[model samples]
Target chain A: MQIFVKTLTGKTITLEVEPSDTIENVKAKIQDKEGIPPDQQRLIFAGKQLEDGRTLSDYNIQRESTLHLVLRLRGG
Target chain B: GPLGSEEEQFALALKMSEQEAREVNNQEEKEEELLRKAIAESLNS
Candidate 1:
């Protein structure tokens, strides 16, 4: 399935995934493409947080669903 | 022919500076617009 993922800054991109793919797998792909590590990203779908161990199916995600990603801030 | 006057030279210098600043501002605006479009395209692709 294809999903739309957008960062907190409003930068958006489309991603392709399978229903069997874990949310962690999606994070990894985002990490690779956006240069943001999976650990530093917070993915939310349907107003619920997505767990790394859970599959996209667990969240009832489907084609054309929108996912919002917020990046963790750091540094003093 | 007396090379005009010092005040004329001063005014000419200020005019040149103003034109140069305007060009620089225009260039910066173009670059920013290009960057915005490029970022959008990167996401779309």
Candidate 2:
């Protein structure tokens, strides 16, 4: 299926993932695609990430669903 | 504010478009492009 995410530099990312991947796997994929540190990557869904230990299955994600990955970098 | 509404959609589009540094929106041209690409990828696989 197809999934989408956005990177820090205003680039849209499209991933074609299979059903076996987990949310963590997606996060890692985003990190690898955006070349950003995994620590700084935040996946915002419905306004927040699934509370700890929640998988994508916990959410309403289906095959071909799209996700948004934003970099919540703060600057002074 | 619903942080994930527009912000999320925009961000998702950004990631999909960066390959060719291209951005796709709800526009027909973009929708066609995305659907086309999806179909092409599926066919190739």
Candidate 3:
């Protein structure tokens, strides 16, 4: 299944994932491709935050589902 | 079969073109037959 990770800056990240994949796994993929570290990324779907500990299936994420990714400000 | 008879090559070419037109396109079957018909006539020329 494919998911869309729409960013705060209007960039949409396309991720190919399985329903069994964890939210943490997704963040790793984004960090691998987009240079955004998993620690600094927050994924939300259906107005609720996605917990990295849970699988996509746990939250009922399906193909073509759009997730909002908000970046945590870093560096002092 | 790459170096087969001229008729075979022509048939393959026509099929290849028709398949390319049909694949990965958003056109409906109705509109697509129109395209397929045009290709055959043009290729026959």
Candidate 4:
């Protein structure tokens, strides 16, 4: 399965992974590719924030699903 | 004036646009005045 992750600055990256891959793993990959720390990043999919421990299959995320990657500067 | 009527609402919108134009002009004037003051002080120094 492939997921399209879009950042705040309109940059998008496609991550190829299996259904068993966790959102945490995807965040790690995003950190490696975009240089954003995993802890400081927030992922939104289907109008909801994705939890780190959940699998892509758990969220019913299909191939080509777009997830917004928002950088969290400071928690209010 | 009651705003439920379309004509009255349209007139209100036009008035708002004029107000916004005046506000922009005032802002530009203030900015120009600040620049002028800065230039004058710089020349005096």
Model 2 residue A8 lDDT? 32
What is candidate 4's lDDT per residue for A1-71, written digit by digit as tens? 78888764557798887788998898888888888888876777755678889999998888877777665
TM-score of chain B of each: 0.73, 0.41, 0.43, 0.74
- For each candidate, what's the DockQ? 0.02, 0.02, 0.01, 0.01
State the lDDT of candidate 2 residue by residue for B1-45, as single tens digits. Answer: 655688788888887777445432334464444444444433343
Q: Write the per-residue lDDT of candidate 4 for residues B1-45, one digit (tens) a residue.
A: 754789888999999999999998986676455444433432342
Q: Write the per-residue lDDT of candidate 3 for residues A1-76, one digit (tens) a residue.
A: 8988876456778999999999889999999889988887767677566788999999998999888776544312
Candidate 4: which stretches are off by over 4 Å? Answer: A74-76, B1-45
Global lDDT of each candidate: 0.74, 0.56, 0.75, 0.74
| Model 2 segments more than 4 A misplaced | A7-9, A73-76, B1-45
Please write out the lDDT profile of model 1 over residues A5-73, one tens digit for every residue: 876456788899998989889999888888887876667665566778999888789888777776544
lDDT of 1 by residue, B1-45 (tens): 576799988999999999999998986676455445444543554
Which regions of candidate 1 are displaced past 4 Å?
A73-76, B1-45
lDDT of 2 by residue, A1-76 (tens): 7777743345678876655666667777776776766555556554444332456667766665555454433211
Q: Which ten residues in a row are the worst by lDDT in model 3 chain B?
A: B36-45
Chain A of model 1 scored by TM-score: 0.90
Better model by lDDT, 1 or 4? 1
Per-model TM against the reference: 0.58, 0.48, 0.59, 0.58
